[PDB]
A paper describes a structure:
Here, we report the biochemical and structural characterization of two membrane-bound MBLs: CJO-1 and [name]-2, from Chryseobacterium joostei and [name], respectively. The structures confirmed that both proteins adopt the characteristic αβ/βα sandwich fold of B1 subclass MBL enzymes (0.59 Å root mean square deviation [RMSD], over 220 Cα of CJO-1 with [name]-2), with two Zn(II) ions in their active sites (respectively). Specifically, a hindered access to the active site with the contribution of a Tyr residue in loop L10 and the presence of a positively charged Lys residue in loop L3 limit hydrolysis of cephalosporins with charged C3 substituents.
[name]-2, like the MBL [name]-1, was found in [name], an opportunistic pathogen of growing importance in the clinic which can express 19 variants of the soluble B1 MBL, IND-1, while CJO-1 was identified as a putative MBL sequence from the environmental organism C. joostei, first isolated in South Africa from dairy tanks. The sequences found for CJO-1 and [name]-2 were LLNC and ILSC, where the cysteine (C) residue is present at positions 16 and 20, respectively. Pairwise alignments reveal that CJO-1 and NDM-1 share a 25.1% sequence identity, while [name]-2 showed a 23.9% sequence identity with NDM-1 and 74.6% with CJO-1. Aiming to understand the substrate profile of these enzymes, we crystallized both CJO-1 and [name]-2 in their soluble forms and solved their X-ray structures using single wavelength anomalous dispersion (SAD) from data collected at the Zn edge. CJO-1 and [name]-2 have the same conserved active site residues coordinating Zn1 (His116, His118 and His196) and Zn2 (Asp120, Cys221 and His263), and so have highly similar active site architectures, with similarity extending to the positioning of their active site water molecules. Indeed, Asn233, present in NDM-1 and in most B1 MBLs, and previously proposed to interact with the carbonyl group of the β-lactam substrate, is substituted by a Tyr in CJO-1 and [name]-2, as observed in some other B1 MBLs such as BlaB and SPM-1 (34), and in all characterized B1 MBLs from Chryseobacterium spp..
Residue numbers in the entry: 28 to 251
Write the structure that this text describes.
Amino acid sequence: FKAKEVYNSSELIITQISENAFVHTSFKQTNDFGNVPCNGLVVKSNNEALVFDTPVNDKTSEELIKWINGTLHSKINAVVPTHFHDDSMGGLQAFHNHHIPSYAYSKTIELAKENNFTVPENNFKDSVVLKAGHKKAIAKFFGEGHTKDNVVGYLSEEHILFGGCLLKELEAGKGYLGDANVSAWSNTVEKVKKEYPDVKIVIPGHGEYGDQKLLDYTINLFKT
Ligand SMILES: [Cl-]
Ligand SMILES: [Zn+2]
Ligand SMILES: [Zn+2]
């Protein structure tokens, strides 16, 4: 499947990557890395949708929600911020304003509270299986890396791994390490690689998606 841009408002870009899945990209202004693109994932089936990661703020989250409802004609069954930083969770309040349930790893909820961020509603201690139509997606904690709380999402039918910020794009630098566990990062991603051996598409938290090579690249980037 050839990636196709299907929406571009400059603040929000949506790229179709399978018959049923889309990457949403929003932008966070930074001091150390300029204007940073930030990825999430939308899966649709039977006029229902799952969303991994909020766009970076409420405004673009409202924009994404309006597009899923109004153009994909789909209700959003759940949103999963894959870690507590704003480029996965910064627009969580917009989702709660639409009464969309949020699911997150226990540590994401702990760190949201510690930082006085919007708090995901439904705690999972290891993994949770979420449904859109007949499709099942797994959100799962494999270990620490980019943060102590980072989780991935996996769509088994389409073999799509949303790696979140635990996964780097090919040739990426190490990025922001303030909250990272660099002693665990490679081991964590090695466990991801072994659990999803049929993976066809890997989406990083920032930059260009790819295939299984992004796991290998990330594993080696952080080998100590
Ligand atoms: Cl980063
Ligand atoms: Zn982050
Ligand atoms: Zn990130």
